[PDB]
Design a protein around this ligand. Structure first.
Ligand SMILES: Nc1nc2c(ncn2[C@@H]2O[C@H](COP(=O)(O)O)[C@@H](O)[C@H]2O)c(=O)[nH]1
Ligand SMILES: Nc1nc2c(ncn2[C@@H]2O[C@H](COP(=O)(O)O)[C@@H](O)[C@H]2O)c(=O)[nH]1
Lengths: 226, 226
């Protein structure tokens, strides 16, 4: 769905029209999805930067391309969950739609060989990530959560869960990386509880592009120009 | 492999000759195993009690039966790992036998429906277990680890990993429960690195009873009387 090096300080992140699911056993191509996800990442990164979150966003380079800061990437995917959906149904005997009493943070080791298994703080330590780093990472993820869920709730969108990735900059500061989009979040309409995210593609729920268009219109206030 | 109520304060824990593996898809019966595991649990509980670990062990009731304290059981299995073996090979790209730089503690939610999935502190909280409780539980597991690994290393046995369970007594103190035996630990001979534990049954490595007998002889100093 997405890195083209420039130099020491920066690289290009390009969003593609490809989508994969289920460990890459399901593939399809959606015209315009690159564009939507690039635009929506920019909007989210900017909102978070205003709230004092250090992100890798530097600028736009036209098309579906962002200029981003180069980082020593942690091999983690950091998942924040507000509402029970997806893999959480297999870890806790709770139904889809269940509202958690407080946010859940899950750590996944980015490892294709092992299919991205969940880890805790001890596994992370063996992977070279101190407890203090983990604490800072979860603290940021949790703050990101509050900002994004408030912003979206005030637009008729429930932030069900989402995935973040992080890296360290040259000062040793922890920096939010990768993307933030309907590909990497669960977004539900506040009224109907309908999916406006990758679950439309994952579980064949309708038209992916239309659901992404609705999110873009309902966030930005104007329909997608492309 | 094992509860017969007495009253409010206590119950009977009986160790049986049955063994199961792989989610109960593998079954077999081993004459004498109940007896060995009961005796070895007693020895371990006593050693830990001397070192100031609160356990549910009250007394022996002859045969393969222990008198134990009744508790509000946490629905957890708490795993401590010193050497890479078993499921850890699927979570970290490390070989069997790899010596961890420090102990790993893993939490599993005891749930047959969900096949005992791993959890973190956030899942535990949703299950009703405060962060403070979790911290006390891991602190005890880690202390138990030091005591058991020292004691066994001074007998030519490597403590690879093991599983603990816990409950709360009426004072709200956290109490070590279930069993401690070759069923619930990985034990390797310090020289040959051979298994003297349930892995003999799990992966058809030889004679289970003989491996358990060796552990009993090499711990107690005398061969099993039965
Ligand atoms: N695009 C993408 N999203 C992910 C991945 N892993 C987790 N997520 C996001 O994180 C949340 C939880 O995922 P789950 O564990 O339920 O599959 C969902 O919003 C999901 O979209 C991934 O590998 N790719
Ligand atoms: N008897 C028993 N032992 C377990 C269970 N779950 C974990 N253990 C113990 O905890 C350690 C780690 O298990 P693993 O996750 O590698 O299967 C091993 O020593 C194993 O014997 C269980 O359900 N039953």
């Amino acid at each position: 769905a997405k890195m083209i090096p420039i130099d020491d300080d920066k690289l290009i992140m390009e969003f593609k029209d490809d989508a994969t699911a289920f460990d890459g056993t399901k593939k399809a191509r959606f015209k315009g999805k690159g564009w939507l996800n690039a635009q929506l990442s920019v909007i989210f990164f900017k909102l978070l930067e205003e709230h004092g979150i250090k992100t890798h966003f530097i600028g736009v380079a036209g098309g579906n391309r962002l200029i981003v800061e180069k980082l020593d990437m942690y091999p983690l995917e950091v998942v924040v969950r507000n509402v029970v959906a997806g893999s959480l149904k297999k870890r806790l005997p709770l139904p889809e739609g269940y509202e958690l009493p407080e946010p859940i943070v899950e750590l996944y080791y980015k490892n294709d060989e092992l299919h991205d298994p969940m880890i805790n703080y001890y596994h992370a330590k063996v992977l070279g990530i101190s407890l203090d780093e983990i604490k800072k990472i979860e603290e940021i993820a949790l703050k990101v959560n509050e900002i994004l869920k408030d912003y979206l709730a005030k637009k008729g969108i429930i932030l069900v869960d989402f995935k973040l990735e992080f890296g360290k900059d040259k000062n040793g500061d922890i920096v939010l990386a990768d993307e933030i989009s309907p590909d990497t979040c669960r977004f539900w309409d506040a009224k109907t509880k309908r999916s406006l995210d990758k679950d439309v593609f994952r579980f064949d729920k309708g038209d992916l592009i239309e659901a992404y268009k609705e999110i873009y219109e309902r966030i930005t206030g104007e329909k997608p120009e492309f």
